[PDB]
Amino acid sequence: HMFSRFSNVVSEIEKKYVDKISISEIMTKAIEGLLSNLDAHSAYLNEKKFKEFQAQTEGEFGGLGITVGMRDGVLTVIAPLEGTPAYKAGVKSGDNILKINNESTLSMSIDDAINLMRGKPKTPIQITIVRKNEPKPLVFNIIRDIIKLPSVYVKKIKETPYLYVRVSGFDKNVTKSVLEGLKANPKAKGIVLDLRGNPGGLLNQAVGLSNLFIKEGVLVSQKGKNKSLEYKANGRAPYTNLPIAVLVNGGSAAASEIVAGALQDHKRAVIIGEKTFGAGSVAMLLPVNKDEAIKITTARYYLPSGRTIQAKGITPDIVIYPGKVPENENKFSLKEADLKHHLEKNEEEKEVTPKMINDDIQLKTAIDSLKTWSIVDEKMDE
Amino acid sequence: HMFSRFSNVVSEIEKKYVDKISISEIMTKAIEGLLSNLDAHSAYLNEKKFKEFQAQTFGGLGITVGMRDGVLTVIAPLEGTPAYKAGVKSGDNILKINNESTLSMSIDDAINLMRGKPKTPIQITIVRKNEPKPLVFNIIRDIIKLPSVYVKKIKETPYLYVRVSGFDKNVTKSVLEGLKANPKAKGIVLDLRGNPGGLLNQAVGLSNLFIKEGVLVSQKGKNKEESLEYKANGRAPYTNLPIAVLVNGGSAAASEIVAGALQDHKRAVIIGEKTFGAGSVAMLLPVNKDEAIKITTARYYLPSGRTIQAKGITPDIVIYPGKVPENENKFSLKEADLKHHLEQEEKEVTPKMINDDIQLKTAIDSLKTWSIVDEKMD
Amino acid sequence: PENENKFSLKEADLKHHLEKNEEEKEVTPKMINDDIQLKTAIDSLKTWSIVDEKMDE
Amino acid sequence: PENENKFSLKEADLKHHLEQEEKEVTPKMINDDIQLKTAIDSLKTWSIVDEKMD
């Protein structure tokens, strides 16, 4: 016990501060203030925060599935996602949330609105809407369900032998969802892997994903004052010869930098894009009360060659800033007929199309690296 | 007892953080973390900083900084100082100082980054509402001095213009002698635009010239003792003189105490735009053998029982900045142009300056209305 | 003169209601903004009302 | 293309981060035509594939 220096301060504050506050409020401010002051990433997860961490790392969410966008400072829905109970109901793009269970909106931020709207999946809820043509509200009574958000998806590229794989965050679904996504396309000759903007997630999915492609050696190593640990490939990897080009960006951080760093140090892929965020540590999450937890930075991590990235990111092999591709000055005179025949349905989101490759020069650059690798394999098989 | 949660949290932090830290570090982080979650204005002083503060009785940019909607913002730069010349403005958000990010720092941290020895350079990055990008300013620190107050006569009128740029010492004598040197005058324009604050005893020292009786302002916390109340004394020389006061979003604190006291006693007309509400006062307290805390202790209350936090003062007549309108219809017809009409039987404020801001014009037009109501009633 | 802190041209504050009407019985704030001489005539009545209320003794 | 978004947040900007532990083709020439950049980016891919296979 040496808490006297602190106990004097809480004693002086409750006596001389402007307003009335309790020891329960002062101790809560001191706990959330201490963890926020150890390093950039330690934190206190009270009961309103801890439920979000569980939801995001499971991939399961309870609510409406309507994308609210704060247009003009008001609760306009940009898009319902397909197959959610609210998409089965009559709400559409451009609908505005006026009231929740007949309680009024007031240009407030989305945070407490979704805190009210995320009732448990067993219970129906009422929402009041304004649709832009109407002088009167629309009222929806919606029976609920759990909804699933996929963190990873895979597409063919329409003209060529190559796949596009997007991983948007790390969670328990990722390793299984990539493995089945390659098994469904046995004709494929290479992967573009898109980690742009991915903030990280569970550490066992960074080791899991990178072990789909590397056969032998260390993947990552940890150090800290207490016993420290090392991860090695299990020897059982599929896909050990397939070409990979990986895209990284200034928003890529933490677990995203573990897999991009492991592939770079083992010469297993080409790294393309811009310099990353530079987060070099691992954090452990501990329950401390019945519905409250703490997150505390517990180790630093090292890439297979013994280097580390704390406060300086991964540097690409090929550097390229964002923009649209250059154009031919002839362009068929911009013929409005488009070579369309006009002689007279498809799920075309099955494939990536040339129009939306021309809109992203970083994606074009990743495909042109795969086309170079395919030539060197056809040379070297002699 | 009450330390159950805290002692559990401290035990994990000592056990399994990345680096070796002692209880002396953990208690110090818990103190600074508590005050940073209590209010925007508080701070902790260790055994070096607390004596260093007592030892110091200068140099800087002359920016005044204030917390609004969770961001550090400029209140107003003073007219003489390097930041005013450099093009810093009210309502600018401060993004970086010498490449340190402002994302998680107090008003007291930002002031201690800015203050320093004269001729030392500094760099500041700012966000401004109309701009496509952040603006970078490079400025050299100084110890410039200029008078806060001046009095100028308005050309072709009975009226005086009085400027008060900040409530530093001697403002009462500087204003009073300017009036005593102009005994023929018939009204004041008092310009408090862009005035960021100053000394309370000088602010009530100004309004005691113009109000004979009653409460000027009052200071309150949760305790009954130390609930100070400030009242006028009967020596006020100028009880009948007309006044128009100018205020805008760069005016705060001591400049709002003057405007709110004159408005509640009906002694003046307040003109311009809503002020920046800054109604709180803070005190410094020793807490350990050789350490201190700064914390907010009381709020200010106007004669009507309204408080300045965070509403400020609203003017009686609202008008935004701009130039006056002008006469195009110059060729129009008059009696003097008809055939066979019956016949007839520079140390001063110039018109060219008054035409360049309509806020100053509107203050003079109010003094003209007041002068007519006096002449009617006499 | 007009405030630089624009409302981004929002339609009547999202044309608020919460559940002809002889509007031309009254002068609106929109039609005062179109005539600076009419605004200036009202500001004189505001000044006179303060000075006359100070003299309630 | 060019780096317009110069101001953005990194680990080195945060409050309590853990600490660190005439006769040639010039970069100014390579920025003026994207065809010459694309040739060098293809050679950088080839060098990596050789380093893998060795």
From TrEMBL, chain A:
Keyword Transport: no
Alphabetical list of InterPro entries matching this protein: ClpP/crotonase-like_dom_sf, PDZ, PDZ_6, PDZ_sf, Peptidase_S41A, Tail-specific_protease
UniProt-listed GO biological process terms: proteolysis; signal transduction
Domain of life of the organism encoding this protein: Bacteria
Pfam families in UniProt: PDZ_6, Peptidase_S41
GO-annotated cellular components: outer membrane-bounded periplasmic space
Keyword annotations of the record: Hydrolase, Protease, Serine protease
Residues of the PDZ domain: 50-118
Family stated for the protein in its record: Belongs to the peptidase S41A family.
NCBIfam families documented for this protein: prc (TIGR00225)
Stored PANTHER family: CARBOXY-TERMINAL PROCESSING PROTEASE CTPA (PTHR32060:SF30), TAIL-SPECIFIC PROTEASE (PTHR32060)
Designated name of the protein: Carboxyl-terminal protease
Source organism (scientific name): Helicobacter pylori (strain G27)
Upper lineage: Bacteria, Pseudomonadati, Campylobacterota, Epsilonproteobacteria, Campylobacterales
Automatic annotation (TrEMBL), chain C:
Domain of life: Bacteria
Residue runs in coiled coils: none
Family: Belongs to the peptidase S41A family.
Protein name as annotated: Carboxyl-terminal protease
Organism from which the protein derives: Helicobacter pylori (strain G27)
Lineage start: Bacteria, Pseudomonadati, Campylobacterota, Epsilonproteobacteria, Campylobacterales
Shown stretch of the complete protein: 372 to 448 of 454
